[model samples]
Target: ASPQVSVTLQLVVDSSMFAKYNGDAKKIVTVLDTRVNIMKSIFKPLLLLITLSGIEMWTSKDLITVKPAGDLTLSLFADWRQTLLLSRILNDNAQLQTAVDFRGAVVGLAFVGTMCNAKYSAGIIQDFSAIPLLMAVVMAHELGHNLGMLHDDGYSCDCDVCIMAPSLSSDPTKVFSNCSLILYEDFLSNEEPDCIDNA
Candidate 1:
């Protein structure tokens, strides 16, 4: 019922992201990979419409390839920068925890990409064990932004049918509502998408 576009998700990590892992980036990666898989599972029903079989993880050292493609200073130091710009465009779906017009939404990202700034979310986010699932939920919502989708319909859950939800939760099985699916199609094609019912 929808179009499956080739999605290339890149996860860019900085030193701060590893702080919670006690400076073990590998452990963070391991956790995220597992969560990414779970994230894909959430979209299982719409596998025909989206595919995330591939994901790339990069240390901030590789910021060149991973950072927003543009003037390095602007993408990093400017007032209107990566996460800041993103926050302006979309709801702070993720708070201290943390898309696209969007075109190059990463399949996943950790620190240096603020949602939790230095922390994660609540609910399933108790302690740090559920970070991966929360991250996955954030990734899905951001991916929706990358697909040029917006936030409208959502309440609270580990997941929701609308990937456009403005807030993140423990729900790992969230998918796009039928209405948002239409916008997703338009996003992939570089067209201005219309708002969905948000119902």
Candidate 2:
């Protein structure tokens, strides 16, 4: 039997309005609430399927589970501490060897701060309506890393609309270029081992 694929997701809330919002920080709370409403009201049940497909693609499993890890105060200094802890956990668990961090920070209600560490396949997103797009792209990028993909400006240009592009500023909704999709499909179908396995 193949090894079971599992995912543990923790949502940490970091905001100063804890008391006023009753454990719900206004920053992420508002953004997520609005997005949920929009998804339900407009996208209907298909919205859930779309989100689940993205998750399944990442885990390669039929089941995708999400768990909230509670809230933590957000500070640049403290944030790194959390990051180190997450990295340590991923390194320690063989089953979770592919763990990724999705970090998001809402900055002043204008721009969303998002970042991903390709080495660890970790991703972060800032609070915004673009969360869905960001999540999909980050998952694709991390999957690329897991498959031993390298940075290529040429590929980025060819699929400027894909999430695999070198720059996110070019397009927001795209999650993967045709090149990226083909490469990943080939890798999985062929069971091609990553460079790490060769070494």
Candidate 3:
């Protein structure tokens, strides 16, 4: 059994990612749906449910600048999320974004411990594969950071598939560790997390 917690997510795709799939919004949604499904299963050990409530596609042009630096892109995306996305949509928990690869080692970046925040619960994933599972793994890892889980470096999390690993793994198997469960509990036990209540 796992704890009773849930998070609703808003998936967003940039123009570059749309172009990567030949401007097919349906394909992008399929990828996002599959990615969220993988995330829902990844967090199942903790008894956490991840729901994709809505999806936004920036097909004609990117709403924010897509840069080579993941950090910069994340910062800009977060700002746009606050001033624009939130005002327009009523997302309960967080927003996940996908864009073209930054052409570097960084595949994802996110604000730590901001799962239910209106201004901070947003992250960007670098779309680096035709197969959605690859980006799904990165999305899960980034979402873990938002959920207050850190790199499982040397911790007893040496399981089959530790989503919180410091580095990305090609393996498709994705699972959370004991440490991640504790971290998630810590986050929930803190100040009231109101967003997940609707679930």
Candidate 4:
């Protein structure tokens, strides 16, 4: 039998997102909930359960400087998560930074197999909402990276529209490919992390 793995995810929004919604807390919360719901649905069949552990918003000012480069921004956000957010809160397996536009073509970036480690279990997603499920797709794709999934980049994997595609797109079917499922198994069978106990 396949047992499900549970991940407790925390959402952190930057001031750019706050400014996008005109600093309306309720509206921001609503969008975060929608994003979480979308993630839960997409990951369920993969024997993964994503729970919204908590939500933090930078209402006044950003704790870390958000740059126009996804690579640099992810590095800064991960450092902030490890040094500051982890100290203030506990029990979240991974944290996601919902940010604004970056200059490059990248919408999100996260290190592979970083889940469950306090030092690296964080990702950055640009809050680009061109499509209704764009945020969820980008966040979910980045989270896939954290879960050790690589791009569905071979002949063995194909779907109508996959979440783990090499390039992020609005046309996503919001589902993982066969390659991603294989990666999930690899993540599970390998050195199971301590935070899996939190599952």
Candidate 5:
């Protein structure tokens, strides 16, 4: 039998008023889509592998939902705390409307006035692109939060090249390491399997 689980994901972008570092709406949307696609690809294979191994079974009851609510157009003054507070309110409202245990994981992309590290830069547009990988790392990091995972201390500081690392100053292509994958699987197994009606 397959485990019943549902995942509903929402993507919200700050409005033009709250433009990202590059200040290009098209670029922001492209990055967002790239991130989402990367996540889907990574999880698709992982899920299939898990199912094949019979370590766990997942059914359609497991809902992985995605929502794009346009832009918030928040102010530059808005900091992480403020952004989170507003997001919580909006999420709670959405949950009440849907009657689902919706978990909110927010990932914001904004250019800081820091020096650009050539190593992390997305190369020329026509050439090999790093944007997808960069966005993937950010999105994956947030998804880790949604799935009840934490930042790894080993990568929290310097010498960090893993997605679970605390800061984004490190490599951008890094996804969940083998250790993270095992931890997440163990967590899902040990936690209340039926907490989500589908799960």
Candidate 6:
């Protein structure tokens, strides 16, 4: 069981295909659905609030708000400080009426649909079209970073289930190793942020 952990997200996803899926339609819908399921299923039987930064495709429990989308480049993902600042900026920029100032409320994730590379971000699907399940797991790994998780090896371990493993794993987001669980557990407890209850 997880605590009342909450987060606001900005999806820097490919903006073109939304051109088809109903003007930011299909991709957004499926991705958020996938996101909610992934987090709830894996992060313990709980809620994984998924929200569009500004789009209103659904209800209020996702706990989302708008962020200034123009300035968040991909480079910000790697730098801890930059990522944190961006999260705050995104939170500040959100217009969600119930938006809270929880320190951990906002996280920015840059998800490329076709499986782009980030300086040897190996182990991920070479082509996302090759596998429909790839994005959800990879996005979980991405969220791990936003939440301050590091490489499993960085923790002197061999847990493939760890989302922070060097590069992606052949197995998708099926597991989170002891190290990861512990780290994430601690973060979740301390963060004390809450997304609107959806799942």
How do all models score by TM-score?
0.51, 0.36, 0.90, 0.92, 0.45, 0.50
Worst 10 residues of 1 by lDDT: 117-126
Residue 47 of model 4 has an lDDT of 69
The residue-by-residue lDDT of candidate 5 on 1-199, one tens digit each, is 1244433333443232123224554654565556556766545534511111011111122122222220121122123213442344221100100112113332332221111111110110110124677656665554554454566666333335766666654445454666666656665666543323242
Clash numbers, per candidate: 15, 4, 0, 0, 13, 4
Q: What is the Cα-based lDDT of residue 25 in candidate 6?
A: 57
**What local lDDT does model 4 show for residue 41?**
86
Model 6 lDDT per residue over 90-143, tens place: 431111111112133222233321111122111111113324345455556655
**Candidate whose TM-score is highest:** 4
Task: Please tell me which model should have the higher TM-score, number 3 or number 6.
Answer: 3
- The lDDT per prediction is 0.40, 0.31, 0.76, 0.79, 0.37, 0.40
Error of 2 at 191 (Å): 6.5
78-171, model 4: which lDDT tens digit per residue? Answer: 8888899888776445544555678868778888898887778888888777455877888898888888888887466976378888886557
- Model 2 misplaced regions, further than 4 Å: 1-9, 14-30, 33-121, 126-158, 186-199
Model 3 Cα lDDT, one tens digit per residue, 80-174? 88888888887754554665667568888899888778778888887766666676778888888888887775446656467787777777557
lDDT of 2 at 87: 50
Task: Give candidate 3 regions above 4 Å deviation.
Answer: 93-96
Please identify which of the two predictions, 1 or 4, would achieve the higher TM-score against the true structure: 4
lDDT of 3 at 184: 77
Between prediction 2 and prediction 6, which has the larger TM-score? 6
